[PDB]
Amino acid sequence: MRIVEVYSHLNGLEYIQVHLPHIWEEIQEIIVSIDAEACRTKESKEKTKQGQILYSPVALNEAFKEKLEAKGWKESRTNYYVTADPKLIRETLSLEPEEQKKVIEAAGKEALKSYNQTDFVKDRVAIEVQFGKYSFVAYDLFVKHMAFYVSDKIDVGVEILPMKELSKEMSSGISYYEGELYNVIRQGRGVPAVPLVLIGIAP
Amino acid sequence: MRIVEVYSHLNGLEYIQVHLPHIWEEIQEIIVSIDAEACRTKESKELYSPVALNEAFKEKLEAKGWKESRTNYYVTADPKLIRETLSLEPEEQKKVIEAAGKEALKSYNQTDFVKDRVAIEVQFGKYSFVAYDLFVKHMAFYVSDKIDVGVEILPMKELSKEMSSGISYYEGELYNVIRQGRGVPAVPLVLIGIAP
DNA sequence: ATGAATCCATA
DNA sequence: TATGGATTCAT
């Protein structure tokens, strides 16, 4: 596949190029190695596209998974305890799971265990590949990548998305690069706090 | 139903209390007037129905004048052009983007309840919906100058545990916001956690 | 009886 | 026509 657009948020791309140059080389290689044609096997049942053979998100997801795990990218999970008290939250935000619980419960407040898990993490870099609803991209950017960043698990996050040129060749209602880039820029300079590299791809 | 927790983000609640006091009174009244018992369902988990709770609020809100709204905007691949057209109106964004020789893509956000420049998102859905509501939907109306403060109604954990799996809860979403750091997102908000 | 995948009711 | 959320579909 082709890398059409790349956006470096908080200079996350430069950080990788300086500290983890092999990671950037590897990500580009993985994308270039994906044969989008072999993933064009989803026969649409939508009335507005009845019969068209579209790119399959399932096939695309499998293709990336195969290449990433083959390069040593592995699943990672980060745990943390949440609570209703804003102050206790700010206090335990950067502490270890065990201490977060201890601190919250020590104040007589209920500690609720939660977490975030992602399939592709390597050398303190997390990659998310998304071919689905708009809401999941917001969740990835402002919650998942952030959770791993705050818990000191990754230094930069990466989000791979289909350009509009590709999303229009998939089932309707799928998030695309241009739209998600806009959602991030709309936040204003410096938000979110986690450095990121947004990548828009096409066949 | 009852309000268990309230979080004023960027003093959004105070903003409403000063400029639109009738809105805060109305929001409280509506929550109190909803009977969670009439929103129960016969289904087991590994209960209260999200659809029923949603319809309950929808009825009350629309009866009080809350109506759906939509904000349009043109997106594009060039970051510089985005920052230049963020605050402009739809047709003007298109104009500016296409004049720079770039492709302009029509998009928008739509929400069910808006009134007196306030948006209320009732949310009894899957885990990714609140993040989208806060960082995308509310921000879109705020940046397009359609609302001054956003409101998010969510179930407390004690209610979500009595609902189908995967439903986000107040304590967790509050955490997601505060984890961003002070002042983020940029739109003033009032997060409200409820229980039966 | 969940999480995805994916269809489609409106503005 | 694109989004938001409804509905359908593999576990």
From TrEMBL, chain B:
<dbReference type="InterPro" id="IPR011335">
    <property type="entry name" value="Restrct_endonuc-II-like"/>
</dbReference>
<dbReference type="InterPro" id="IPR015278">
    <property type="entry name" value="BglII-like"/>
</dbReference>
<dbReference type="GO" id="GO:0042802">
    <property type="term" value="F:identical protein binding"/>
</dbReference>
<dbReference type="Pfam" id="PF09195">
    <property type="entry name" value="Endonuc-BglII"/>
</dbReference>
<dbReference type="GO" id="GO:0009307">
    <property type="term" value="P:DNA restriction-modification system"/>
</dbReference>
<dbReference type="GO" id="GO:0000287">
    <property type="term" value="F:magnesium ion binding"/>
</dbReference>
<dbReference type="GO" id="GO:0009036">
    <property type="term" value="F:type II site-specific deoxyribonuclease activity"/>
</dbReference>
<dbReference type="GO" id="GO:0003677">
    <property type="term" value="F:DNA binding"/>
</dbReference>
<protein>
    <submittedName>
        <fullName>BstYI</fullName>
    </submittedName>
</protein>
<dbReference type="InterPro" id="IPR011338">
    <property type="entry name" value="BamHI/BglII/BstY"/>
</dbReference>
